[PDB]
């Protein structure tokens, strides 16, 4: 249902070049790297399995990149061209193409329109920045596990923000103080965390 994440599907945080944590983070999911050590656990903790450079982390990373490539290759159903803002919108299922840096200030609503099989793929050509206390919400049967944020460079999740979905970034994912995620942080470089909660979702 949407992009196949393969062995990456159980990970809350996956980054080849490490996960660097500050504060009382809780990862409800697996965590891995391709060999780089993680730092800041404790005081962080994970409730799933740690996979630092084993067969699972190699296959999970490869699968995360396969999904990134497939996500970028999809034909857009909605061309948003140079639109810079996501906040204050209600989006039905689609592949949404954004050509430049996007921000989310306020609330974004993902409307399943009564169909739980609804898929969202956000094709963000460069950066994603979510603002402080921003939120993504699900209505009318939308499922977090069917939402994909395909971030063309790096994602910055703002302080005390809330995100639903699978963040598949080409490079860095930074979750600022208190950001919460129902989904996953699948980075192409590093993940930085500060007092976050990440909970992996199923569909």
Residue numbers in the entry: 1 to 203
Recite the paper's sentences.
An asymmetric unit contains six AnpIBP molecules. The final model of AnpIBP shows the structural coordinates of 203 out of 216 amino acid residues. The crystal structure shows that D55, whose original residue is N55 modified with a glycan, is located at the C-terminal end of the long α-helix and is far distant from the B-face containing the IBS. Among the six AnpIBPs, half of the IBSs were covered by another protein, whereas the other half was exposed to the solvent. When we identified the water molecules whose oxygen atoms are proximal to each other within 3.5 Å to be connected with a hydrogen bond, a total of 88 water molecules were displayed on the solvent-exposed IBS. The molecules are mainly organized into polygonal arrangements similarly to those observed in Maxi, which extend over the left and right sides of the IBS in AnpIBP. There are at least 13 polygons on the IBS of AnpIBP, which are mainly located around S153 and T156. The presence of four regularly arrayed hollows was identified in the IBS of AnpIBP. The distance between the first and second hollows and between the third and fourth hollows is 4.6 Å, and that between the first and third hollows and between the second and fourth hollows is 14.7 Å. These intervals perfectly match the oxygen atom distance in the primary and secondary prism planes (4.6 and 14.7 Å) as well as that comprising the prism ring.
